C-alpha cells in the first residue's frame, strides 16, 4: 500500500530485456569475440557472467522489487547512510540521458536517409566526399571509407568541428531526429510503466525480428561462413591472457544494467512474491543470447565483405557506433534489396536504444516519484520538464562537433562512476545491510533463500569483480582521444567532474545524514545504518 504494478510481467520481462539489450550488444560483444580467442572468449565471459555479472544483476532486480520503491528511497529504506547511492545512481542515468538518445537519433537520421534504392553511403562521388575516400574500409586513418565519410562528413558534419571547444553550428536535421526520439520516449513513459511495459513489446521484440531477418540474410551471403570463423574460432591462448578476462568482466558488467537504478526501479513495480531470481537469470540469458545471436548477424556480413568486397577483416570488424553506422551499412548497400535491410536495420538500432532509454529515464522518474510526492502526482509534466532539459542540452549533440560531445560523456557519464556506485551497492547490501537479512528478504518473496553461491558472489566475488575491472580500468587509463583529436586537459577534468558528481553524493549524503542525526558516533552510525524496519 500502495504502488502501481506491471500489467502482465511480460511487460516487466520485455521492459527489462529491452533495457538490457542495446547497441552495445551488437557493436561490442561480437568485437570482443573476434578480439579475444574467438568462441573461447565465451569461457571467461561465462565465468565472469556467472560470478560477477548475474549476481549483481540478480541483486538489483531482487533488491528493487523487495523494497518496492524507487532507487533513492530504496537505499534510503535500506541503508539511510548510503542513500546517496540512490542519489548517485539516479543522476548517473540523468547524465547518460543527454548523450545516449543521440545514437537513436542517428538511427532515425539514417532511417530517414534510408528511403531510396540508391543508398548515399556507398558512393565516393558525392558532395561531402574527399579525394582520400575509399569504396570501403581501409587501413590508413587519413583515408576514410565511403560509408565512413557519410557518417562523419554528412550526418555529423564532424569535420566542421576542430574539437570539443568548437561545437559548430547545430544540425537541425539531426535535432529533429533527437526530438522525434524524445516524443517516442515521452509518450512511452507518459502514463508510467502501464504504458511503458506495453510499449516495450515492440521496442524489445522488434530487434529479434530484424535480427532473424538479418541473420538469415547474412548466412545466405557468399563468404558468410568465413565471418563466423573470424567470430567463433577459438584461441584458448587468450584464456591465459589477463586482458581477456578483463574484457569479459567489463562487458558482462556493462552489458547488464546495474548501477543505473533502472533494474531497481523496474523490478520494484513487480508483485512482491513475483519470482525475481527466475526473471533475473531468464533476462540475463536472453540478453547474452541476444548478443551471441547478433554476433552472427554482424560477422556474417563481415565475412561477406572480406570475400565479395575485398576488405581486410580487421578493418571492417570494429566496436562502437563505427560498426553500425558505417561498417555494416557499407555492406548492405552492396546487397540486393539493400533499402530493405537498411530500413529495418536502423529501425532496429532505434528500437534497441528506445527500450533502454525508457528504463534509464524510468529510473529517474520512479526514484523521484517515490522520494517526492509532488512530481509523483505531477508526472507527465515532469518527463516534459525533464526531457525538455534533455533536448535543450541535446542540441549540443546535434551540433557539427556532436560526436565529440557524445564520446566525452560516453567515457565519463557512466564511468567508473557506476563501478564505484555498484561496488558500494554490493558492499552496502552484502556487508552493511547483511546477507543474512537479504537472503531472508528473498525467501519471503520467491519463497526460498538464495543459494550459497549467490550469497558468496555478493559478499566476495562481486566486490573484487568490480574492483578487478576498476583497477584494470585505471591501469590502462589514457586521456580522452578520438581519431587524431586528443581532448584538452580541461575537457577530461569535466568528465571526471561528471563522474565524481554522482559518486560524491554517497559520502556527501553520508555526511549530510550523519550531521542530521544526533547522538554519539556509534549511536549516530547504527541509527543511520538501521533499515526501514519498522
Amino acid at each position, epitope marked *: 500500500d500502495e504502488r502501481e504494478t506491471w500489467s502482465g510481467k511480460v511487460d516487466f520481462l520485455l521492459s527489462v530485456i529491452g533495457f538490457a539489450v542495446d547497441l552495445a550488444n551488437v557493436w561490442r560483444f561480437p568485437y570482443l569475440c573476434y578480439k579475444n580467442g574467438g568462441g573461447a572468449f565465451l569461457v571467461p565471459y561465462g565465468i565472469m557472467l556467472a560470478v560477477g555479472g548475474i549476481p549483481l544483476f540478480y541483486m538489483e532486480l531482487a533488491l528493487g522489487q523487495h523494497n518496492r520503491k524507487g532507487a533513492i528511497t530504496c537505499w534510503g529504506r535500506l541503508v539511510p547512510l548510503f542513500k546517496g547511492i540512490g542519489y548517485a545512481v539516479v543522476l548517473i542515468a540523468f547524465y547518460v540521458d543527454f548523450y545516449y538518445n543521440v545514437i537513436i537519433a542517428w538511427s532515425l537520421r539514417f532511417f530517414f536517409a534510408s528511403f531510396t534504392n540508391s543508398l548515399p553511403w556507398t558512393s565516393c562521388n558525392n558532395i561531402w566526399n574527399t579525394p582520400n575516400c575509399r569504396p570501403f574500409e581501409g587501413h590508413v586513418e587519413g583515408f576514410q571509407s565511403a560509408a565512413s565519410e557519410y557518417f562523419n562528413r554528412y550526418i555529423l558534419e564532424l569535420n566542421r568541428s576542430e574539437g570539443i571547444h568548437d561545437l559548430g553550428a547545430i544540425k537541425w536535421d539531426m535535432a529533429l531526429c533527437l526530438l522525434i526520439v524524445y516524443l517516442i520516449c515521452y509518450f512511452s513513459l507518459w502514463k508510467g510503466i502501464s504504458t511503458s511495459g506495453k510499449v516495450v513489446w515492440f521496442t524489445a521484440l522488434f530487434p529479434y525480428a530484424v535480427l532473424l531477418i538479418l541473420l538469415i540474410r547474412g548466412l545466405t551471403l557468399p563468404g558468410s561462413f568465413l565471418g563466423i570463423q573470424y567470430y567463433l574460432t577459438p584461441n584458448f591462448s587468450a584464456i591465459y591472457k589477463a586482458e581477456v578476462w578483463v574484457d569479459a568482466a567489463t562487458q558482462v558488467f556493462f552489458s547488464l544494467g546495474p548501477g543505473f537504478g533502472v533494474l531497481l526501479a523496474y523490478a520494484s513495480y513487480n508483485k512482491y*512474491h513475483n519470482n525475481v531470481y527466475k526473471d533475473a537469470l531468464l533476462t540475463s540469458f536472453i540478453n547474452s543470447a541476444t548478443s551471441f545471436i547478433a554476433g552472427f548477424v554482424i560477422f556474417s556480413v563481415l565475412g561477406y565483405m572480406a570475400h565479395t568486397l575485398g576488405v581486410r577483416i580487421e578493418d571492417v570488424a570494429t566496436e562502437g557506433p563505427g560498426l553500425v553506422f558505417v561498417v555494416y551499412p557499407a555492406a548492405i548497400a552492396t546487397m540486393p534489396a539493400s533499402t530493405f535491410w537498411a530500413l529495418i536495420f536502423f529501425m532496429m538500432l532505434a528500437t534497441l536504444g528506445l527500450d533502454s532509454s525508457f528504463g534509464g529515464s524510468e529510473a529517474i522518474i520512479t526514484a523521484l516519484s517515490d522520494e517526492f510526492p509532488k512530481i509523483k502526482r505531477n508526472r507527465e509534466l515532469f518527463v516534459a520538464g525533464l526531457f525538455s532539459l534533455y533536448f535543450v542540452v541535446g542540441l549540443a549533440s546535434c551540433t557539427q562537433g556532436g560526436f565529440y560531445f557524445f564520446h566525452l560523456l560516453d567515457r565519463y557519464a557512466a564511468g567508473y562512476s557506476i563501478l564505484v556506485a555498484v561496488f558500494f551497492e554490493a558492499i552496502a547490501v552484502s556487508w552493511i545491510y547483511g546477507t*543474512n*537479512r537479504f*537472503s*531472508e528478504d528473498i*525467501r*519471503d518473496m520467491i*519463497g*526460498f*533463500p538464495p543459494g550459497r553461491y549467490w550469497q558468496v558472489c555478493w559478499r566476495f566475488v562481486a566486490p573484487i569483480f568490480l574492483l578487478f575491472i576498476t583497477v584494470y580500468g585505471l591501469i590502462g587509463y589514457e586521456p580522452l582521444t578520438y581519431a587524431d583529436y586528443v581532448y584538452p586537459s580541461w575537457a577530461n577534468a569535466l568528465g571526471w567532474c561528471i563522474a565524481g558528481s554522482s559518486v560524491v553524493m554517497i559520502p556527501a549524503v553520508a555526511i549530510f545524514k550523519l550531521l542530521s542525526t544526533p547522538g554519539s558516533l556509534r549511536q549516530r552510525f547504527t541509527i543511520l545504518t538501521t533499515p526501514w*524496519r519498522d
Partner: antibody
Amino acid sequence: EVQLVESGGGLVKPGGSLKLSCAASGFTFSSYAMSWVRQSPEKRLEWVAEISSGGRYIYYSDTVTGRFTISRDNARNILHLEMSSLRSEDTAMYYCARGEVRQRGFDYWGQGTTLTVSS
Amino acid sequence: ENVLTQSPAIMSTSPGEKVTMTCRASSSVGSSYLHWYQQKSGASPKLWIYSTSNLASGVPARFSGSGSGTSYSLTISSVEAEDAATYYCQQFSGYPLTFGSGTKLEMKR
C-alpha cells in the same frame, strides 16, 4: 543429525497465557526459518505461525493472530511461541518445524509438546 | 484461507495393492508450493513429498505424486505395512498456510 526439541506446554486455564520453546540442533538455526504447526486432539493439522531466519518476517493464522507471539533466539538456537488469552479451541500438540524453503515445505519436525486448555 | 480437503479420510488397502489419495484446494496452488506429509500413529509428521512430484530423504520410490492447480494426488505403487499412516498435504502458495483433511491409510487383513 537435525533435532528439534519442543518444550513447555501443559494445562492452562482459558484466558491464561503460556510460553512454548523449541530447541533446535544439528543445523544452523539462523539460516532456517521456523514454523509452529499444531495438531488438535481430533488430528487436525493447523499452521499457527511462521518466523523467518532472522525473524523479521512473521505470519499468523487468522485463528491465533494477535493472541500468539512467535519469538526467536538465533544465538541459543531456540524457537519460542508466546501465547496469551488462550482458548479451549487452542488445545492441541504444537510442533516445531523448518520451514525455510517454501518449495520444499517442512523437512524436519520436533517431537512435539502438548497443550491443554481447560477449566 | 485456502482450504485443502483430502479423500478418502479413511482408506483401507492390503499390502502390495496400489492406492491413490487426492488433495483438492479451494484455491489454485503452484505445483512447486504443494507438499505431502506422513504422520504415523503416535509419531511426529514427516516430510514425504515436496513440490508435488518430489520424494523426501528416505522416502521409498514406491511413492509418487501428481496433479496441479486445485487438484493434487499422492499415489503408492505397491503399499506396505510400513506405509500405514495418516497423510497430510500442504500448500505454501500463500498464507495462511494450510494442511489437508488428511488421508488415514490402514492395512486390510
